[PDB]
Amino acid sequence: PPSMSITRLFPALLECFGIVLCGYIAGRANVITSTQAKGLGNFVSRFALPALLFKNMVVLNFSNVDWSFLYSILIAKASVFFIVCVLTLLVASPDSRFSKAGLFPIFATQSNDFALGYPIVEALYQTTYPEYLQYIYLVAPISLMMLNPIGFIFCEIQKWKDTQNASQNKIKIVGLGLLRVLQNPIVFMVFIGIAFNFILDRKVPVYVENFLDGLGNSFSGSALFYLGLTMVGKIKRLKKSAFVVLILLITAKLLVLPLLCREMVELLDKGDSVVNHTSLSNYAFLYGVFPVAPGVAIFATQFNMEVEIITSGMVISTAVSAPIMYVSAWLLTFPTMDPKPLAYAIQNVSFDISIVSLISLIWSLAILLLSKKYKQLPHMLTTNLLIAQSIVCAGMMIWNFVKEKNFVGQILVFVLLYSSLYSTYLWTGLLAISLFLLKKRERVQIPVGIIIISGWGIPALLVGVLLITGKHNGDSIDSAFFYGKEQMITTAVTLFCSILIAGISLMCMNQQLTRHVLLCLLLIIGLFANLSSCLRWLFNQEPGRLYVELQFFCAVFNFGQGFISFGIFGLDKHL
Amino acid sequence: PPSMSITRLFPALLECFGIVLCGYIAGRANVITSTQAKGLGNFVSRFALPALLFKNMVVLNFSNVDWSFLYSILIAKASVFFIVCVLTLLVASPDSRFSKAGLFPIFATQSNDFALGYPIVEALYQTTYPEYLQYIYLVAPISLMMLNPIGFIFCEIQKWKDTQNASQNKIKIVGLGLLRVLQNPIVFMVFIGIAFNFILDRKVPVYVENFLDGLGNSFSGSALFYLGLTMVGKIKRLKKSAFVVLILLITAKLLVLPLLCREMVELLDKGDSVVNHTSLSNYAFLYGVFPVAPGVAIFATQFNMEVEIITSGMVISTAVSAPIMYVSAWLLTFPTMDPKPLAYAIQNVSFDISIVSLISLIWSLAILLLSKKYKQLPHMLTTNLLIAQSIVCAGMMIWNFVKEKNFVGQILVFVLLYSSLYSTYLWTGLLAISLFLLKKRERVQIPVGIIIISGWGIPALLVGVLLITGKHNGDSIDSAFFYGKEQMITTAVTLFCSILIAGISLMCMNQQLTRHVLLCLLLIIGLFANLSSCLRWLFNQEPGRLYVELQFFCAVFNFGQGFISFGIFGLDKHL
Numbered sequence A, B: 001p002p003s004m005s006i007t008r009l010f011p012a013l014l015e016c017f018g019i020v021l022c023g024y025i026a027g028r029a030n031v032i033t034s035t036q037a038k039g040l041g042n043f044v045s046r047f048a049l050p051a052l053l054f055k056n057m058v059v060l061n062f063s064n065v066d067w068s069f070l071y072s073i074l075i076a077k078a079s080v081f082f083i084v085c086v087l088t089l090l091v092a093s094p095d096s097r098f099s100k101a102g103l104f105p106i107f108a109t110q111s112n113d114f115a116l117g118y119p120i121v122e123a124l125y126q127t128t129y130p131e132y133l134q135y136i137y138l139v140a141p142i143s144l145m146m147l148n149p150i151g152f153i154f155c156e157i158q159k160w161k162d163t164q165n166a167s168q169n170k171i172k173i174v175g176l177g178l179l180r181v182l183q184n185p186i187v188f189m190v191f192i193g194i195a196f197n198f199i200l201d202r203k204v205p206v207y208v209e210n211f212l213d214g215l216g217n218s219f220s221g222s223a224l225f226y227l228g229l230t231m232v233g234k235i236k237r238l239k240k241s242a243f244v245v246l247i248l249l250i251t252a253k254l255l256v257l258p259l260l261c262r263e264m265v266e267l268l269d270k271g272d273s274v275v276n277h278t279s280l281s282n283y284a285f286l287y288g289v290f291p292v293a294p295g296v297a298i299f300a301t302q303f304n305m306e307v308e309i310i311t312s313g314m315v316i317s318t319a320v321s322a323p324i325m326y327v328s329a330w331l332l333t334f335p336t337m338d339p340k341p342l343a344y345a346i347q348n349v350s351f352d353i354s355i356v357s358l359i360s361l362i363w364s365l366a367i368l369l370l371s372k373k374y375k376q377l378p379h380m381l382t383t384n385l386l387i388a389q390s391i392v393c394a395g396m397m398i399w400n401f402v403k404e405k406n407f408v409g410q411i412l413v414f415v416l417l418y419s420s421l422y423s424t425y426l427w428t429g430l431l432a433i434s435l436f437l438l439k440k441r442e443r444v445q446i447p448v449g450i451i452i453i454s455g456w457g458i459p460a461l462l463v464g465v466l467l468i469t470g471k472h473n474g475d476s477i478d479s480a481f482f483y484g485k486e487q488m489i490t491t492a493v494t495l496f497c498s499i500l501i502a503g504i505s506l507m508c509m510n511q512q513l514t515r516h517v518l519l520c521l522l523l524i525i526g527l528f529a530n531l532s533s534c535l536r537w538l539f540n541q542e543p544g545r546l547y548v549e550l551q552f553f554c555a556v557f558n559f560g561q562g563f564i565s566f567g568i569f570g571l572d573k574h575l
Ligand SMILES: CC(C)CCC[C@@H](C)[C@H]1CC[C@H]2[C@@H]3CC=C4C[C@@H](OC(=O)CCC(=O)O)CC[C@]4(C)[C@H]3CC[C@]12C
Pocket: A013, A014, A017, A018, A020, A021, A024, A231, A232, A233, A234, A235, A236, A315, A316, A318, A319, A322, A323, A326, A327, A353, A556, A560, A563, A564, A566, A567, A568, A571
């Protein structure tokens, strides 16, 4: 069976993250100041969300719930909480380890289940498994009732020891922690909704149904937009200690939790048919990938606890969960697809990513060109990288129309697509070189002509060499296999040349500029994901679907890298 | 054919106005301050509304439109604009008549078409005539493009002549008026959406569709809530000149415009079937009764032109439009219903109104009791009026279950219902008496025992007299006819006694207190509507459906007057 309507996921990510991007663009532009944003937030959190919760809680058929699925997602969230909690207590300093162990486990476990989770689960499962949408309104509140009072208890313990008590009365610490979690609209409107579920026998009165529809339907768009507004100005410059803790907590949230969810569902929910069980453990995985809840950042800013790591981490967790949800959901869907419709689905993914990536790149390029920054170094060289990324995205669009049409168009469009693709790799190298030569070799002139010649000619030399030395693999749909093993060898050698050049240069540089360094680092990370995926493809001699999985991992960066350069330069507040 | 799903209207009014009531309660409570409210407003007006407009404009099948229906609603709005514009120029003083003639015609014609209009049209017509929903997104923007630059031109003419020019360049006056109307998201996103309708051949791209869904679906609840927030503190104390101009402009908006819309549709759209034409002129009427747009108040508060009358008038127009939409839509639907299902539909209306009215009265009574104000005069006597209205509402709920069941229950529930009903009339009189005796006869003691005896015993005497002197009209379902003509005689005589007492006393009083005086006036207005409806029922000797129309008009005030007491005392910021 299809298990997930996976083709509905990209439009649903573009809905949810495009509304988050609208809120961000609005707050950055000061269309809505931070003072004004609290009105949307108070509407969202105190009117729209509590109505959405009440509606769904009253309607819920509790005898239709897979309780072992709830227990296993809750045991996965509770064990990640316990892991991050115990580790934070053991690793952090005695002066703040209870503020850290309070909120770092809440961060690693409280998903944005209602605003991001629900629309994405509705997109994936409303047709194949409409019952999966019940578990958001169950898991998310029950996870608050378990885990948020434990983190609030740790925060009250910090204040109790900071005020130099040997102990306070423990009942007031546990009582205020519990009372603070009961005061959250999420918890008490779930309690009220569970009560009215029984009082009404699940029939929402016709009078109240449309009132709850109007408030409930308003939550999704307004909460994503409020989330975007709350991201403005939250990525503080962090020390390396704060930055490594942030990477570890975003890892706990977006990698360890979804792996533990998938495992806990497979170990604890053993009472179902293999199709349901596989779909349900796949659902458990993408439940773990939902980003940190803005409620943790709202708590951190109001308590003034760990504000830098938690507000920055909530923003980076939000943004990073979008590609991880996409990549993860497709990886989990791939086992259901036959190799031929799978190949077309991966090309359709690449067309989708390259359409939206090309639009974001055209905006970013226009911004770089109109700001007239494109005449400086490093900006000329970042503008050449964005042009290479734009010819890559347009090339994938043209390829999806040409893919099996005719040999003349295929060869020219492959030359365009792969020369511009190798060019994006070599431009990550050459841009990182120019940052090394600008920061360190100030006296020495940078050869702009030789750099523009190398960034465009060496890719075209590599593509010419490949058309000469390779055999046409015309039995293949995928551009990432149109010249066979020697194309993955050429791709991998180009990635290794670029990661050498860019690693050498950003190292020697450490031995405007912050945006370009950050771009080169994020692109280097992407090139290392592509290199490791391409080397792993080249080393696997035994046949498998693993080939088309690794081609999908490569394609996501090849065509999606326009979003890294849009994120850094399309949204640069300096232009 | 049914023409309107009229039973879906009351839940839709409760959705729309309950979300307006939530926004009001939130702003009054300072859950969302006026500074914070601008964030919800900027989301609503600059993100959610323009996405809703673009979505529906791109989807619209323009060859499916009845252009004569559009022309006639626009000619009805343009003629109300012309009437109010010319009258305001002729009646007002030279120092401000161009500011008044700018915004008073915009007020009298710019409906709240997107936030209140659309969900109410959807509830009435989505099943019977889904094409009727196109015309909100057509009429509202085109009405802005015609009429809003003319009112902006009159405001620029005020500034141009107040700055003592003989005249300015007329092209800059017309050009700034038109440029200001083009800057409205409504106008330019309709232009952009019409263009993309043709560019895309109406197919919203799958990528953009769910993005426009998430923003567009969020507008409905957020705009009603923002409307509620913007109502807080806007009913300024007005002079009589301002108050009469406000009554006249609310009359132009909510009575003259829907009458002219209905007439213009019948005179100008002659090319259709009788069933279509009747439903389309009924739709034209309910289009005109939508309240004033919050965009006129937003303009007035930013320009500082006519703020008192426009912002107060927009709030009162909002509140007054709900009962007018309900009464009008049912009056227009009554010609489609056979007398027996019509009778049951009218009693179901009465049950609906009395359920929600009883809940609002239980809140208002609890507020008066817990504030302990109920021990003062006039508050004891307003509390007795609220108890009478609560027994009227409970009595209608009990009656709808008992209505044709058994004689014993019918006679007791009729005694309870009609004695408490006559008691609400006599308590409007006795309350207005106690205001006269408090303001004027300060030295004289008010006989609280005799007043409570008269307010409950005289109604029970009247009900006893009616059970003695009349005959059981057991062939009738309606409580308002269960004891025949002598019940409407008793009801009308009780109304005439109450309206005498209350008119005499509020007059002699003019020869806390302002809330109670206002309650007596609003209830006196409704008792006069009931008296005139009951006298008109008693005078009509020729048979007709007019009887059950007039019984519906009586019943709406009988069971809905609990909302006047909720509006004054349930929402009193002093408690
Ligand atoms: C590429 C495929 C696999 C999935 C689709 C990914 C999108 C959902 C991504 C691509 C670009 C991303 C955006 C690019 C840039 C930004 C700015 C970014 O700003 C900050 O982090 C700075 C916060 C501050 O101002 O302090 C917030 C995330 C956001 C909106 C990103 C949200 C997620 C987006 C839309």
